[PDB]
Structures are given as C-alpha cells and as structure tokens.
Amino acid sequence: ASLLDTNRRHTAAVPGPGGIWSVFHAGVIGRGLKPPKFVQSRNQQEVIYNTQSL
Amino acid sequence: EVIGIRQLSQSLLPAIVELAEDAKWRVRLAIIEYMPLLAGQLGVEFFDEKLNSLCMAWLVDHVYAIREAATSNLKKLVEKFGKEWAHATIIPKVLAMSGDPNYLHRMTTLFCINVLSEVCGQDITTKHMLPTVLRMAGDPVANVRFNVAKSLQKIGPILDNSTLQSEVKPILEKLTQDQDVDVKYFAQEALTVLS
Amino acid sequence: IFSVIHSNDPVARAITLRMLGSLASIIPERKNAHHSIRQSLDSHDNVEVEAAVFAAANFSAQSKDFAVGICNKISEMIQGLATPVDLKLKLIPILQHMHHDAILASSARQLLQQLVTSYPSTKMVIVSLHTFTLLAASSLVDTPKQIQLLLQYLKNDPRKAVKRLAIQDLKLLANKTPHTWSRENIQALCECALQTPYDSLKLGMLSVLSTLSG
Amino acid sequence: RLGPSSGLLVDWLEMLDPEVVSSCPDLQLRLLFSRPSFRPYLLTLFTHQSSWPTLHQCIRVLLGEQRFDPSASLDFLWACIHVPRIWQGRVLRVQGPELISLVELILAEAETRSQ
Amino acid sequence: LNKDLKPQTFRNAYDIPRRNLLDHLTRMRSNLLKSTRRFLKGQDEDQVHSVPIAQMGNY
Amino acid sequence: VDDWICEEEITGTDALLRRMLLTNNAKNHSPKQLQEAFSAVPVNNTQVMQIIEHLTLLSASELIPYAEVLTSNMSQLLNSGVPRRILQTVNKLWMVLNTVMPRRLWVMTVNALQPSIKFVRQQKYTQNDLMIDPLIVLRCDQRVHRCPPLMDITLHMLNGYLLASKAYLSAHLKETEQTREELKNALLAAQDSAAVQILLEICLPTEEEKADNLLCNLREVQCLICCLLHQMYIADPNIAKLVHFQGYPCELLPLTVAGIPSMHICLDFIPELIAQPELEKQIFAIQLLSHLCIQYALPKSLSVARLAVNVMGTLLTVLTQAKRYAFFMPTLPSLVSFCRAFPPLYEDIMSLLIQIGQVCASDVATQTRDIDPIITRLQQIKEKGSMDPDVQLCHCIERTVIEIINMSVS
Numbered sequence A: 001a002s003l004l005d006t007n008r009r010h011t012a013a014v015p016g017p018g019g020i021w022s023v024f025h026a027g028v029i030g031r032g033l034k035p036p037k038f039v040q041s042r043n044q045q046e047v048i049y050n051t052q053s054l
Numbered sequence B: 001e002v003i004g005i006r007q008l009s010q011s012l013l014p015a016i017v018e019l020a021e022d023a024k025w026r027v028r029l030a031i032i033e034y035m036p037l038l039a040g041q042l043g044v045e046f047f048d049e050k051l052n053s054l055c056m057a058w059l060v061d062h063v064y065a066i067r068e069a070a071t072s073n074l075k076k077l078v079e080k081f082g083k084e085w086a087h088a089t090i091i092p093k094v095l096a097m098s099g100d101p102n103y104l105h106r107m108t109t110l111f112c113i114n115v116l117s118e119v120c121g122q123d124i125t126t127k128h129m130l131p132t133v134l135r136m137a138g139d140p141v142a143n144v145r146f147n148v149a150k151s152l153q154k155i156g157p158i159l160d161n162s163t164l165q166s167e168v169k170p171i172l173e174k175l176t177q178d179q180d181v182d183v184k185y186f187a188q189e190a191l192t193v194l195s
Numbered sequence C: 001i002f003s004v005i006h007s008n009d010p011v012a013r014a015i016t017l018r019m020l021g022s023l024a025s026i027i028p029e030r031k032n033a034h035h036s037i038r039q040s041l042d043s044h045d046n047v048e049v050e051a052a053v054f055a056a057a058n059f060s061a062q063s064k065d066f067a068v069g070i071c072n073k074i075s076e077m078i079q080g081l082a083t084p085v086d087l088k089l090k091l092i093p094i095l096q097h098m099h100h101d102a103i104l105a106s107s108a109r110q111l112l113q114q115l116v117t118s119y120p121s122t123k124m125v126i127v128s129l130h131t132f133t134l135l136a137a138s139s140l141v142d143t144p145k146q147i148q149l150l151l152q153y154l155k156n157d158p159r160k161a162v163k164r165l166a167i168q169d170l171k172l173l174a175n176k177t178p179h180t181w182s183r184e185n186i187q188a189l190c191e192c193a194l195q196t197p198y199d200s201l202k203l204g205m206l207s208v209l210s211t212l213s214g
Numbered sequence D: 001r002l003g004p005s006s007g008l009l010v011d012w013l014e015m016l017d018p019e020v021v022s023s024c025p026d027l028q029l030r031l032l033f034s035r036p037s038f039r040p041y042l043l044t045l046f047t048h049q050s051s052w053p054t055l056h057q058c059i060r061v062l063l064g065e066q067r068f069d070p071s072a073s074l075d076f077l078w079a080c081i082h083v084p085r086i087w088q089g090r091v092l093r094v095q096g097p098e099l100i101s102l103v104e105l106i107l108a109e110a111e112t113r114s115q
Numbered sequence E: 001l002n003k004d005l006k007p008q009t010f011r012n013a014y015d016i017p018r019r020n021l022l023d024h025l026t027r028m029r030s031n032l033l034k035s036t037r038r039f040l041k042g043q044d045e046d047q048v049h050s051v052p053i054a055q056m057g058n059y
Numbered sequence F: 001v002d003d004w005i006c007e008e009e010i011t012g013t014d015a016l017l018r019r020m021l022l023t024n025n026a027k028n029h030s031p032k033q034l035q036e037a038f039s040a041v042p043v044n045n046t047q048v049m050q051i052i053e054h055l056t057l058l059s060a061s062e063l064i065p066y067a068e069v070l071t072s073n074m075s076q077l078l079n080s081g082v083p084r085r086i087l088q089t090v091n092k093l094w095m096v097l098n099t100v101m102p103r104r105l106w107v108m109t110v111n112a113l114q115p116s117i118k119f120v121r122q123q124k125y126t127q128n129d130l131m132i133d134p135l136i137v138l139r140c141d142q143r144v145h146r147c148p149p150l151m152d153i154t155l156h157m158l159n160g161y162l163l164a165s166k167a168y169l170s171a172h173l174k175e176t177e178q179t180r181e182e183l184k185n186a187l188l189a190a191q192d193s194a195a196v197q198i199l200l201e202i203c204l205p206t207e208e209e210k211a212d213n214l215l216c217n218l219r220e221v222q223c224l225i226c227c228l229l230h231q232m233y234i235a236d237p238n239i240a241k242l243v244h245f246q247g248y249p250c251e252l253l254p255l256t257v258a259g260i261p262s263m264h265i266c267l268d269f270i271p272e273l274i275a276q277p278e279l280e281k282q283i284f285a286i287q288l289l290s291h292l293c294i295q296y297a298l299p300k301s302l303s304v305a306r307l308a309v310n311v312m313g314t315l316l317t318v319l320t321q322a323k324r325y326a327f328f329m330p331t332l333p334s335l336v337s338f339c340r341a342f343p344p345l346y347e348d349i350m351s352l353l354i355q356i357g358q359v360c361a362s363d364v365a366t367q368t369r370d371i372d373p374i375i376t377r378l379q380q381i382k383e384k385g386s387m388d389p390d391v392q393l394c395h396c397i398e399r400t401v402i403e404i405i406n407m408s409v410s
Helices: A002-009 A044-053 B006-019 B025-033 B035-040 B044-050 B052-060 B064-099 B103-138 B142-154 B163-175 B181-194 C002-006 C010-022 C031-041 C046-062 C064-079 C085-097 C102-118 C122-139 C143-156 C160-176 C183-194 C199-213 D006-016 D025-032 D039-049 D052-062 D070-081 D096-113 E021-033 F013-024 F031-038 F045-055 F061-078 F084-098 F102-112 F127-132 F134-138 F142-146 F148-177 F180-202 F217-235 F237-246 F250-259 F261-274 F279-295 F299-316 F321-341 F343-366 F389-407
Strands: none
Touching: A002 E021, A002 F134, A002 F180, B006 B025, B006 B044, B025 B035, B025 B052, B025 B064, B035 B064, B044 B052, B044 B064, B052 B064, B052 B103, B064 B103, B103 B142, B103 B163, B142 B163, B142 B181, B163 B181, C002 C010, C002 C031, C010 C031, C010 C046, C031 C046, C031 C064, C046 C064, C046 C085, C064 C085, C064 C102, C085 C102, C085 C122, C085 D039, C085 F013, C102 C122, C102 D039, C122 C143, C122 C160, C122 D006, C122 F013, C143 C160, C143 C183, C160 C199, C160 F013, C183 C199, D006 D039, D006 F045, D025 D039, D025 D052, D039 D052, D039 D070, D039 F084, D052 D070, D052 D096, D070 D096, E021 F180, F031 F045, F031 F061, F045 F061, F045 F084, F061 F084, F061 F102, F061 F148, F084 F102, F084 F148, F102 F127, F102 F148, F127 F134, F127 F148, F134 F148, F134 F180, F142 F148, F142 F217, F148 F180, F148 F217, F180 F217, F180 F237, F217 F237, F217 F250, F217 F261, F237 F261, F237 F279, F250 F279, F261 F279, F261 F299, F279 F299, F279 F321, F299 F321, F299 F343, F321 F343, F321 F389, F343 F389
C-alpha cells in the first residue's frame, strides 16, 4: 500500500498557488529511511559456557 | 492612497496576484507585506474570492522568510476580518499542516498558532488550537517538540486559566525530562513562565 | 454485426446482443445468434446478462425453436438460488413468449404457478401474475382458469398492489377475450366489488365490469 | 392457515429485518432450515442480502443433531459458492468436523431421495 | 544501460519508477499546467543540475 | 456507454412495478423525511429502507431532489453493521442519478466520501480540481475499500474523471497554445497507470486482514476493480503495457490474470519486458508469464515460455552470486507453472534446474556454511531463518523440483 498511502499523503493542506498542487520535495535520497537495525544480545552466562564447551 | 482600491482591483490586482507566485522570493515577500493594506481596504467576500487562498499558499512556501511573513500576515488578517472569518477560512487550512510529514510544516503551524492565539481569543485558542498543540509533544523530531514547548509558553497568557494545570502542565512535565537537551531547556523555561 | 459478439469487451458484447434482439424479426432461427444468447445468459458481466435477457425475450417472441430450447434454461436460472431477486424479476417475462406450443405453454403455466406459490413477494408475484396473464392471452386455452386465478388473487390477497394488478390484468382479458368470461367469473367479480371497502379498488373492478358490459 | 396472507407477511419480514437474520436468529434459522412454500424466496434473500460474517456464521452452525433440511442447506452452500459478486468479470475452506457434517448432509439427502 | 539514454521522465512515462510514480506525476502535472508565464522545460534536476563537473563552476 | 446502456429496456418489469406500486399517491417520502431518517441517533436502517426502496420506482428526473440527501448522508453507511440491502439500493439510486446528472453527482459524491478525520477542513473539491487530479477520488475514507457498493461508486467516478481529465488536458493545451503533445500523452499515461497501481494496491489484503479468501468483501472489491481494469486495458492496451513495465506486487498476479480477460495481450510485450536490463522487470515478466501460461495454454504461450527458459539459462551464466540469488529465488516457483502447462518443457526445465543446482552446490562448497547441504545428500521430503543465501537457494531448487515431481505424480 505504498502508493495508496502516498496518495493519502498527497491531500493538499492548502488549495495551492493556482488551484494546482505540486509536491514539496524534489525527490527521495536512496530507498527512503533506513531500517533501525535493532541489535540483539543473548545471555552472557550461556555465552560463557558455550565458549567453555568449545 | 492616490487612486483608491477600485482602480487597484480593476488594474493592478490581477498583475500582483500573478506576482504572488514569482520565482524570486523577495517579490513574494513584497506582496505579503502589501496584503494587510488591501485586506483593510477590501471586504471579506472579495478577499475570500481572490486573495485568501494566496495567503494560505504562502504558508507552504519553500523559503522560510515567506512562511514567516505569511504567518505574521495572518495576525493582521484576523485583526481586520474578525475571528469568525478565521475559524471558517484560516484555521482549517492551518490545522491540516499539523499532520504533514515534513517537520517544516508542523513547525509552521506552531508559529501560526503563536501569532494566532493573540487575536483569536480565549475560547478558540482553548478548544480548537490547544488540542492540536498538545498532540505534537509526541513528535519524533526534537525541533517540533521544543517549539511545542515554546508555543505553550507563548499561548499560555491567552489561554483560559482553567486548562493550564490540568492540560498544559502534564505535557510540559513530560517534555522537561525528554532526551534532547534543547527540549528540556525550552520546556523548563515554559515551566518557569507559567509560574 | 455478429462479429462483435466475439469481442472480449462485455459492453461491446452487450450492445451486439441488444442489436441482435432488435433485429430478431429478420433473423429468427439463426443458430449462431441463438447460441450467442445462450452463452451470454450465464455470463459473469451483469450488462451482458441483461442484454442476453432482452435478446432472449425478442427471439422467443420471434422463433419457436429458441423458445423451446431456452425455456428450461430460463427456468433453472429463475429457480436457481444463486440468481438475485432482481435478475429473477428480469427473467420472468421471458415466459410470456412460451405460447408457441400447447405443451410448452402448459409447462410455462406450471412454472409460473410454482413461482407465485414459492416467491410470494409483491414484486415477484406482480411480475409473475402479469406474465401468466399475457401467456394466457397469447395461448387462449388457459384463459378461463387464468381469470379464475386472477379473481382468486383479487378476492384473497390483501395487498392493494396485488389487487390492483389483478384488476389491470382482468381489464386486459376483458378487452381481449370478453366471450370467454363465464357467469361465475362475473359473479365473483361483482361480489368482490360489493364487499371491498376501498374505493380505488372498487373503481378498478367497476372499470373491468363496464368494459365487460359493453 | 396463512394461505393467501403468507406473501404479505413475507414482504413485511423483508421490509422489517434488513439482513434477514439479524434479530432473533433462532426463529429465522428455523424459517430457512427445518422440516414452507416461501422458503426459497427467503433463502435467496438471505444469500444475496446478508453480510459475509452472517453467512459464515450460518455456514458454521449448519455444519455443527438433525435440525436442518439437507436439500436447503446444500443448495444454500452451492449458492454461496456461486454468488455473482464473487465471480464478476470472469473453492471453499472447511475443516474436519465441518466436512464430516457436510458429507452427512449429502448422505441424508440421498437417503431421503432413495432410488 | 547506455550513457546516451538520459531519462526524459517528463517526456516518457516508461522512465518513471513505480516508487516515484505519484510524486513525479504531480511534478509533471505542475510543470504542464503551471507553465503559465513560466517555462516548459524537460525534467528539472536532471537535464539541468546534472551538468558535467568541468562546466559546474565555469563562471 | 455503461451510463447509457443501463437505460435500455430489458423486459418492462420496471415500468410495470412503477405503474402498480407508485400510483398509491402516498408521496410522503420527501427528501427531508429521508434526511431525518438518516439523522436519527438510534438509527433505524429498516425505516431508511422503507423510503429508499420506494425511490427505486422513481424516474431519474424525479429522483433529482434526493441526491444531496442520499449522497451527503452516505458517509454514515460506511459504519459497521449497515445492511448490504441499504448499500445495494444506494448504489442503484446512485446509478439512476448518474444517468441524468453525472457531473454534479460526482462532485457531491467525492466531497461526501472524504475521510472526515480533520473534517473542519472539509475539502470541498470542485469539478475543476477533480478534472485536474482524478486521483482525488481514491483519497476517500479507507472503509470504502471494503464496501463493494461504494467502491463501485468510486470506480465509476474514477473512470469518468480519468476521461474528463483527458478532455480537460487537451482543452487546456489548445487554450494555452496561443513537444507539449508528448508531455500531455506522457502525463495521461502516468495518470492512468497510477490509477491502476492504486487500485491494485486496494486489491491487496491489509495487515489486519493478513492476521475463507473467497467469501468476503475483499473478493467483491477485487472483482469490481478487475472489471474496471479490464475496461481500461480494452480502451488502451498501452496502459496495460506501462502498468506491467512498472510492475506490481506478485501476490496480485493470479488475481489479475484470472479476473481480467484482457491479459492475453500481455504475451505480446512479455518478450520486450524480458529484454529489459532491470532484474526486477525480468522477474516480473517471468512470474506474469507463468500465471498466463496457467491461464491461457496456447502455442504462442509455449513459445514465450521457451524464450523465458532460454533467458533463464542464459543469464544463469551472466549474473553474479548475489544477482543469481535475487533472480532465482522469486522465479523458481514459476518453473513449476511452465511444467504444469507444458509437459514438452520437462527436458529443458529439468536440465536448467540441474545446471542451477550444480552451480549453487559449487557456490556452497566455496565457503564454510552453517548447514552444508552437500553432506546431507539424502534428505527425505523436508516439509516446512536467517540463513546463507546459497543454502537457501539450494533448498529452493530442491523444493521446486519436489513440487514439479509431485504435480506430475499426483
């Protein structure tokens, strides 16, 4: 629904300079916003004893 | 002053309306600066027919000086044409800018509210503008957040005194422990000014 | 004209079907047109189905073979539970063109009786009774018991719309076949006019009786 | 007996209950599926008028206790599959006990017909 | 891909990616209708402002 | 023509019912009464029906005064629990009003189907605004996307306003004349393709819907959109070509292929689409061809499928490892469809699968792996994480071979 949502965002807040609306931005850098890339860490004790087994 | 405004509307108004969309922003700035005069010399009906949309078109301008001038111009326009006209024509198009994905336009609504609370009176500021101002405290952009703190400081005097501790104070308390140092500073400055 | 029935556009197919229905008088017993109607009747585009119903009406009016070949399919679409009520209403007047043969007319009569007993809505019973009246007028063998049925609905059915339709149909039959009216039919109509409280219905039955008296 | 007046009551039911089965569902379930000349009209109205969650609920309560006419239920299922709104411009998921009750309904219809 | 097939996204609808379809549609609409006492050029930000670096600052 | 042909006679039932039901001269059903019925806080849909059902007997000319009532008050019909009879009758009356005064009706309907969140900004669109930007009609309340009557209303308006925008653009060019024609043509093509893409996105299930698949409002909406897209592709096949060069999510491919009879023309430009340098366009061409081959099994379809298999084999030796993964993960299930449609392709498809599997086994052997499918070598049918791309592609090859075999043995 990327284009559907984009069409929703195109609702003009003001009527426009001459009754015709143009989008504010000149484009999008890259593929938009980057993902947050959330990290994950396991238990440190289990890491210690996995290292111990190895 | 020489030819009156009937001849202005007949001859020069279509030409200046064409200049409200000029490539250079100082031309548009001049047109904004000359809108209060025309407004003060024209009726609500004609201004709404021709020039109100022009006044709204500038709030979304790329240049910040144009947006600032248009915001300051809204105060004079409301002073001239009363606050019912503002509630019918000005306010809905300003509130729509609050939901905009660009933070420049959200900050523009905060500036518009800053200049509009003074002239719109206690009731309009309390029930129409304040709920929109409060919901922007959860914004992800720190700039919008500390401008919310600034706005709540500024529209504090012209709000009714009943909604201060109930509504404005919890939001400022939430903002004064925010992660951004500027949001903290402006929230605590607002907290002092609220007394 | 017929080459446009093969278009993938259902609107073009609908216009072609309507044209074929309009040209039915100069091309009855045209087998390709018959097959086109039959294929478009079970189409999934409502405009094509409506055009097929219109063309089926025209071709059943014109050609006997199409009527006998289509009566079973029309019956199964009408009685089919998947058909909406609106399309059922649109389909019932096809049965008024089943007068080409005595057995065909009798089968259509039986189907219409099944419809009036099994679909007693105001719209459905009105369309079915009008179609039954027209079929009886065209076949003029079931006309006495059609008059008896209409008088039964006029006397018994409490809906003012159904009574009004019964009055209109009896006026049509009086205009068409006054000689077929029995003494018992006129007695029943007179009794109905006597014991009805509503003045509009009474005026209608007296219009029928004044048509008969002339 | 409600011989001639059945049509008026059916019309009033159509005008009063919009979704056919919305108020007192037990009575309308008895009307649609039970041991009625006007039944196919009400079945058509229910098929082409009720909302899809209502039709799904009716399907679930039909397929789980001899309480429903097998012929009416099977015709209703076949109609629900072939609704013209579903195929405009031109296959159902069922579970274990649902399929068991479905084949039981088919067998019941066959036994009633016999040969 | 070639060097000479510079995307005339205003003049050719096949050069517009799906993700950029709506905003660029708005842009070409504005470029067409709002050209009253303006300029009817090709695509801004491509035909212009993608100058070769040698001519970038040839004041 | 759909607005005109609906005025054509069918069997005269409407005339008979009008004559026998409307002559009771109980004309109490004024638009004001309908407005009061719509405005009742404990709203009674039954009473609402008792009026609008009577309005189906009315002629289009005498249905004019009710238009503002059953248009302005029909944002309420999007609320839950509203009967489908009410919506169907509103759709019918909307069509009867569209026959007689479509332009004013469309403007009022667009202004009535606004989302109405910040409805103090009641954006009152005019005819000029909608002719400039026909995509306004698709910025309606989200509930219209699962209301098949009001979706049908919206689709009628969308088609009408796209045509109106064509006319308006030509008129504006002629006026401003005293190239630009190419700019206009590109703008109209972009507008129509954008409309098609938005409708296709409407056809997708939402995340909430993701959380029968045939008996739902979504299926009805998909059928209506497929009907409209069928009409647009018939009107201009270049729009279909542009839409498929843009592409859309592959989840809609069986939907569009089954529901749109116009797609047999897609076999004409699939060889051109395959020739594109973008990998995504070639992937979409392969998947589209697979679905079409499932639908239309024709000698031309077989020839294009042979071309597709040859292209796959060719660029198996052109793409790098990352590109190989990216191209072959979505397009490998499509090879099952070619096998289903064309048994003569068994030799070529199995040979290609053997080549891909051997290449991917070599790539697996290149580096150390967490799974190492080389040493498994004898697994049974492993019916169903962040794994290596190469082992994933190996498993995908195994799974598609299993699907090909199972289809050909059951």
